[PDB]
Scaffold this active site. Structure first.
Site, short mmCIF file in Angstrom:
data_model
loop_
_atom_site.label_atom_id
_atom_site.label_comp_id
_atom_site.label_asym_id
_atom_site.label_seq_id
_atom_site.Cartn_x
_atom_site.Cartn_y
_atom_site.Cartn_z
CG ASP A 186 -6.87 16.32 13.40
OD1 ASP A 186 -7.68 16.67 14.29
OD2 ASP A 186 -6.18 17.15 12.79
CG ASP A 217 -8.78 22.76 12.15
OD1 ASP A 217 -7.92 21.86 12.39
OD2 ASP A 217 -9.58 22.74 11.17
CG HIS A 240 -10.02 14.64 11.31
ND1 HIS A 240 -10.02 15.98 11.68
CD2 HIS A 240 -9.27 14.57 10.18
CE1 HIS A 240 -9.32 16.68 10.80
NE2 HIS A 240 -8.85 15.85 9.88
CD1 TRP A 294 -8.46 14.61 5.67
CD2 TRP A 294 -8.38 16.50 4.44
NE1 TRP A 294 -9.71 15.19 5.70
CE2 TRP A 294 -9.69 16.34 4.95
CE3 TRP A 294 -8.10 17.62 3.65
CZ2 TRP A 294 -10.71 17.26 4.68
CZ3 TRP A 294 -9.11 18.52 3.38
CH2 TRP A 294 -10.40 18.34 3.89
CE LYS A 342 -12.73 17.70 7.70
NZ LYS A 342 -12.78 18.61 8.87
CD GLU A 364 -5.38 14.57 8.53
OE1 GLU A 364 -4.65 14.95 7.60
OE2 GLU A 364 -5.67 15.31 9.49
CG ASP A 400 -11.15 19.03 12.04
OD1 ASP A 400 -10.55 19.11 13.08
OD2 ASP A 400 -10.50 18.99 10.98
CG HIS A 427 -2.00 16.46 12.01
ND1 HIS A 427 -2.51 16.73 10.75
CD2 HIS A 427 -0.68 16.19 11.82
CE1 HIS A 427 -1.55 16.64 9.85
NE2 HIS A 427 -0.42 16.31 10.48
#
Ligand SMILES: [Mn+2]
Lengths: 402, 404, 402, 404
Positions: free
Chosen positions: D245, D282, D248, D171, D214, D212, D280, D272
């Site tokens: 993810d 988290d 994302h 990423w 985003k 990955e 994002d 993920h």
């Protein structure tokens, strides 16, 4: 002649361009100061270089921006831009004298000033709760700051002989799911009722409250929400302030303007570009800005919507920022002034949706630039990209001293 | 007014931008106009809005000519399998043959038009379950397989006859109203079905294949078999085209952003442009932020021959000719606008980190005299110049349209 | 045993489940009639089989479902559900006596009645404007009609001895971009002022206004926006009704209840499952649903939030629809009742954001089924999926024979 | 206590669901815990929040063991390049070698854990322009390429030693803050840089490479070089894994709808899970509808060995061990819930048109006694019963995390 040709084209529709230009000249845009020192401030406390270091540098920078922007306008000041001497004054102790130099400078330039108490980046604001904090002591301190802030607006309006708008925005909310949404909100309501207790003449100060859907570290919940403030403001005869950055995905302020004017009579907005969060990008001449201008002009509200700018990009020239942004909202006003509302309204009134669309669409290729440019000359500001030249000259000799 | 064009040409030429070059290039970009708009998606099978819709193929082609009159340049008609011309003689969709589109080919040829094609997998008995190439029963799948294979033949037929390739697009309604209990099996079935459709090779000089994803439609909101990731993978694996619909994505998801990624791996994309207003609402396309962003991608990536632009809207609340001409003219206005941007200067400011100039000039260019160019372009091309087209529409509506 | 074991687990937190059940037994849930005949109604002028067709068929269908839904509830009626004789009576001319079989029936079953004027599927609603149509003769028709409806609302509350809520919802908007957002709303306001002119006793009737963001053909703009109705309702001391399917992507009714309750006192709601548009999927026991419930319980608002259902799924069994949607919302109330709110309030107050998250998450696995199954036993309704059997029976013998 | 479970096992029995089977397979599936959460994305390169954050490799490893004390089953740890152990030495990122992770590999082995790996393309002098693999500067491009190759090597090293393959996911933060004037040439360069990173052949028995996407980051709001559509096309052409993810993506956009379409073209797949709250952001994974939908998907589609499950979250404001354990135990609960759904009957009802039962039972299942089962499972696996693990975290924070 360029102009003159453009003037005729609008003429055919009954649009009086001279009249539009004459009313445009009048409308004031309130430019945020935060743009100039990257939200720094003088309260004893990688990116594009040569931001302002001191109010002296900061004021210089505004004049430059202002000289590239047609019309006569306003500066939107924050509590943290206080000139205490070398003496550090706690926020609940701010007074007019702390803003003399600002005011004196504004009067000299024939400007209006707007104020905001500052409720972030502070020891008593680190829990992410401020007026809604579970601690009485913390709430008072912040209550007192806002009360102080209101008197400063009052000072501004008295001096500048144009009402100051003092707007409250707070960072209050929680990062993760709250186990209780109501009680912080009850604390905020009580806190406000206190802040607004003493009357001030609406000729000197006006009060506004500003919601945010979400922020960083307040992802999940914001105390002072839309419905909260819309209601609060409605009960207590205050102004709502709407930020084009603070709502849901796909949600527009343009759609809100006309509902709000039916019940409020005055209405404050900050224009900023969201790019997927209250990101504070520089305002651009986009569809939503046009739809905001349209709504403002059409609803005959040029004296009822207090247009303010709110944006912060440190990646690019700070003067160019102000000037791009402010010049965009004016162009948008202008475009909306040059539109056949009466034919358009009477077509929707009588069901002719066909031409309503066709013409809304055709005016997108009419010569805005020929009027836009003429206006810029009449108003003594550089005409197209010419304004970049002044920035370049300015950055070289001064912006890049410090 | 010629002076207006002339002064603007100077204003642009000051940047290296050649308005004569741009107009020439514009001249030859073809837009594919969907027929679904003339007759309210009616078609010609056995089978209180806005008045005077098209009712026969003779009416739909007159209508089309009429809109084409008002649109600058030279274009394409996007046909659907249900606008097949049988006699008064019911032929099932899998039994469809070139013969059923001879009148159209000949008409296109006469008027110098491209034809793109579409199998029709909605509004029919074997579609009533809301599954099609992914239905549980073999006989239903096999039917829609034979129909798509038929439709590939007809597209091959257009390419041959019109000496310009025909894109045959595949869009299917398949999905579920409510939460599914299996998301895979129906996609496995779609995959296997498409594999069967694309078995026989057809020359690419005559017929290209597309597949169109959707995020959701009504009756079909929890889940759609032909998903975006599905058809992205399928087209890559099988050397087929993605068709992208400006209306078929998530809140705030823009196709403008997708073009660049896809040109790196596919070499040709198709688009359908339509305006979503909160759902796949199919509004007439407007000169808006996203339409200009699409145009900028097309032009600046030099994908003018790599992106097959088509339209896809249905407004039955407004005049249909007008619908066509507003939408179509809007996309041409956009491409023009993109053709008049100082890309070289902008690209270089980016590589350099001068974000100040990039935004400043992008922004500045929004009040340049686009209209003066557009007007002149309109006039060299024998269309009404601004609002004027609206006058012929007023005549056509009384004259023919409303004795019908 | 199972239940007694579950009971002990909630009991460890100071959670009296016996008390929660006692209070859960008393909350009414207002079930919409639309679901029974796919919005047909009885006005003189594909999907799943077995739909009601007649007043008689629809009453049996409601009775069936009520009998599989634990507790005692109300039915939410629309004006097109009037039982003229075989007569034909215009919507402005509807009278209490056009709903007297409805009332008698609810008296007979211990049910409250709620009301709605119907402002759609009608000649005088075909231009998509209604209370806001430009033609005064159109508006007046609809003004009268709502007035007629309020009078019926009064009838129910009087007759049934439980206030009836008469909610106004209008389809009014434009499909494509309006050239005027203001003048249509001014008209709604004047129409509503006129509609609400006569006072009716709060013990017999209440009024509510219902916003919406878009519909089909209603895509670009809708007169009765969220800001209009929230403002109007607040000025005129009326109820706001919120429909979970009626807002922006990611916009949650749950986040609104807390602020609304700070200013209104009484709040009305409709639970829909939006799936990407205002689509009316049966309510499922989801995160937002839970969240709404928590909010209704922590906030002490069981008497303050009037819970209605609104959905319409023609693709499944209709009796199943009703019974799946209602049990779910009951289920969620139960869930929220079995939450350690005080320990959670405190941790929030205290900054222990860790415990808060930890235990809210831990409760998602607690033995709700055990409790929920006990409740259904005591309340003489089938216990798990077994209410499906009763549907299969009713479908075989009754439904598939119409 | 063991009868609560018994009574529960039976209710599931009636549907022909084997709860013993379910747990014996649940025991097997490894989750991949991200190391970032233990020291606030600190790392150990020579360069207001909750106290007791981990500050050294010994401290962070001790922390990690603590969280697995409390998470049932056996797992993996997802390492980042900056968590290298160079003695007192200062090694640049392109110079990173298998020896700089020997302690980690020795440790994971003794505790029987797999290890995944990521290069690090942020918090660096050479990533300050916000561009990396797509920087205009070939030397910078080269530098990161070099660094990526390095980490593929180190991952290979992980595969060999721990006898299970390491996923090395790439990423990058490459993008622009404001509207770009070129979406294509930056993706031209990522493509090219990726082609280079991957030209060096590396044994898949030991290392698998992932990429990955985003949608936006703060500072990359307008545009990200790593489009979903770019990586998705990239991974398919070049036989790599997409990593998905849950944060994302676009608003309303779900991973759970992407799984089925992906498994159909890809064979193997990483994800993920993080909780996004409007960005994002988290947050710590909560047992929610989308986590429920992901687990259903992994289970029904027979993909417990085709979906590599990692955690990716960083919430600096709660106890970090709690964060790991709440989060991990949640994905496991979800998996477990998905194992106790009568898939077969539900699948049959969809196939059959009985959307009525499909909906009724999926819902009815939401109140079945998951807790009874999950508690037993927890006990069987030697982890704290319920909330009781909060007790072990308080004991640890007091006499350990706060002797710092
Ligand atoms: Mn703001």
């Amino acid at each position: 002649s360029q102009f003159e040709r453009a003037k005729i084209e609008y003429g055919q529709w009954g649009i009086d361009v001279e009249e539009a230009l004459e009313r445009l000249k009048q409308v004031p845009i309130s430019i945020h100061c935060a743009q100039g020192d990257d939200v720094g401030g003088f309260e004893l406390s990688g990116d594009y270089p040569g931001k302002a270091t001191t109010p002296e540098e900061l004021r210089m920078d505004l004049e430059k921006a202002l000289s590239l922007i047609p019309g006569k306008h306003r500066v939107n000041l924050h509590a943290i831009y206080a000139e205490t001497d070398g003496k550090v004054v706690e926020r609940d102790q701010l007074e007019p004298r702390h803003f003399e130099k600002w005011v004196r400078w504004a009067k000299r330039h024939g400007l209006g000033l707007d104020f905001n108490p500052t409720l972030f980046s502070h020891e008593k604001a680190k829990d992410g709760l401020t007026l809604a904090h579970p601690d009485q002591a913390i709430r008072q301190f912040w209550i007192d700051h806002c009360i102080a802030s209101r008197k400063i607006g009052e000072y501004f309006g008295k001096e500048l002989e144009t009402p100051c708008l003092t707007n409250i925005w707070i960072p209050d909310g929680y990062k993760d799911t709250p186990s209780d949404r109501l009680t912080p909100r009850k604390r905020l309501k009580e806190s406000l009722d206190q802040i607004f207790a003493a009357e001030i003449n609406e000729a000197y100060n006006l009060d506004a409250v500003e919601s945010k859907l979400f922020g960083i570290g307040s992802e999940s919940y914001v105390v002072g929400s839309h419905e909260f403030y819309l209601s609060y403001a409605l009960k207590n005869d205050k102004l709502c302030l709407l930020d084009t950055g603070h709502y849901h995905p796909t949600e527009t302020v343009s759609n809100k303007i006309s509902a709000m004017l039916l019940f409020h009579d005055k209405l404050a907005l900050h224009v900023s570009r969201p790019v997927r969060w209250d990101s504070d990008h520089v305002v651009t001449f986009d569809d939503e800005l046009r739809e905001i201008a349209l709504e403002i002009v059409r609803n005959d509200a040029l004296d009822r919507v207090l247009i303010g700018l709110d944006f912060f990009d440190a990646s690019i020239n700070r003067i160019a920022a102000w000037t791009i942004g402010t010049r965009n909202v004016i162009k948008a006003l202008l475009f909306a002034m040059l539109i056949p509302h009466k034919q358009l309204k009477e077509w929707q009134e009588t069901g002719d949706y066909t031409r309503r669309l066709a013409v809304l669409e055709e005016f997108k290729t009419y010569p805005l630039g020929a009027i836009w440019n003429e206006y810029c000359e009449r108003m003594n500001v550089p005409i197209k990209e010419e304004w970049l030249k002044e920035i370049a000259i300015y950055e070289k000799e001064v912006l890049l001293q410090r």
